[PDB]
Automatic annotation (TrEMBL):
One of its GO terms (biological process) is L-ascorbic acid biosynthetic process. Its main location: cytoplasm. Belongs to the SMP-30/CGR1 family. This is Regucalcin. It is found in: Cytoplasm. InterPro entries: 6-blade_b-propeller_TolB-like, SGL, SMP-30. Keywords: Calcium, Cytoplasm, Hydrolase, Metal-binding, Zinc. Residues 14-270 form the SMP-30/Gluconolactonase/LRE-like region domain. Signal peptide: none annotated. Pfam families: SGL. It catalyses: D-glucono-1,5-lactone + H2O = D-gluconate + H(+). The active site is at D210 (proton donor/acceptor). Mg(2+) binds at E16, N158, D210.
Length: 306
């Protein structure tokens, strides 16, 4: 595979939450510390950003409403109306605060399931690795604007994906250094039967699982924070490492398939230099990467239905 730095995009403190909108051929993503949203149109080499004053962790187009996006603002799920180019949104409409009385929590990774339901989890703002406060939970937001809790005791609420047949959900609590698998009931939106799918310890994989996505063959692609890589793992059989793609940035954060043929893998990373790093500062930059020649296709980003 070929890994290219996207020079036009610069460096991000914690680049995160990549989302590919296939209809407009546009990549959206966030910087979860700098309180900014980002838009990249590769075919036209257009880049824009948008500033808010709360911590953000995802940005997903709202189904049926061009120019509107479902985003996180600390603990609030909100709709931002944004023209895609001005440095500030036009308007902000709060939907729900998922944890109004837990003042030191924030939302982290979030994604729509294939039915358009937003799933997202929380974490302590001062969550730590390998050890720190464990205060997070996993939620989904129904079309009735009520949240349901699905999992608790989450340290660092991170990557989500669903199997192509809607029978499984994959989930990452970075603190656990593993990818979990759940049975997923699409009709009731309930998850059960949590079991480890892939355990980093067992495969001498360094670092922490962060974001993830799934390809058309049902394989998971997992971003490895402080591992300088993405890994390809099987969902058909537990504990099978299929492939490793090295990324120059050590703090790989997340992944999304994109491009006209959905066969380009966009990779975000973090330039934020941490205390206990296994990598010298000069290596930690926070670029965005494009990976091609993986030989698989993924799926377009799902919009949130409300
Ligand atoms: Hg924006
Ligand atoms: Hg925005
Ligand atoms: Mg993440």
């Amino acid at each position: 595979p070929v890994v290219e730095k996207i020079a036009e995009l610069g460096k991000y403190t914690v680049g995160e939450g990549p989302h590919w909108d296939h209809e407009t051929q546009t990549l959206y993503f966030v910087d979860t510390v700098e309180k900014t949203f980002h838009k990249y149109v590769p075919s036209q080499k257009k880049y824009t950003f948008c500033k808010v004053d709360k911590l953000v962790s995802f940005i997903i187009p709202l189904a049926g409403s061009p120019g509107r996006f479902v985003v996180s603002l600390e603990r609030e799920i909100a709709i931002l109306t944004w023209d895609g180019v001005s440095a500030a949104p036009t308007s902000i409409e709060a939907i729900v605060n998922v944890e109004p009385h837990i003042k030191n929590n924030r939302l982290n990774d979030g994604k729509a399931d294939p039915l358009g339901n937003l799933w997202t989890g929380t974490m302590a703002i001062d969550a730590g690795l390998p050890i720190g406060p464990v205060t997070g939970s996993l939620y989904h937001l129904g079309a009735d604007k009520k949240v349901k809790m699905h999992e608790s005791n989450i340290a660092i609420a991170n990557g989500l994906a669903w199997s192509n047949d809607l029978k499984k959900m994959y989930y990452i609590d970075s603190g656990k250094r593993r990818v979990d698998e759940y049975d997923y009931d699409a009709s009731t939106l309930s998850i059960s039967n949590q079991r480890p799918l892939f355990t980093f310890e067992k495969h001498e994989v360094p670092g922490y699982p962060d974001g993830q996505t799934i390809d058309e063959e049902g394989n998971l692609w997992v971003a490895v924070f402080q591992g300088q890589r993405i890994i390809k793992i099987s969902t058909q059989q537990p504990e099978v490492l299929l492939d490793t793609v090295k990324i120059p940035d050590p703090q790989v954060t997340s992944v999304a398939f994109g491009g006209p043929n959905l066969d380009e893998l966009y990779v975000t990373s973090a330039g934020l230099q941490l205390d206990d790093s296994s990598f010298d500062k000069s290596l930690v930059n926070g670029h965005v990467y494009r990976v091609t020649g993986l030989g698989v296709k993924g799926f377009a980003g799902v919009k949130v239905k409300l």
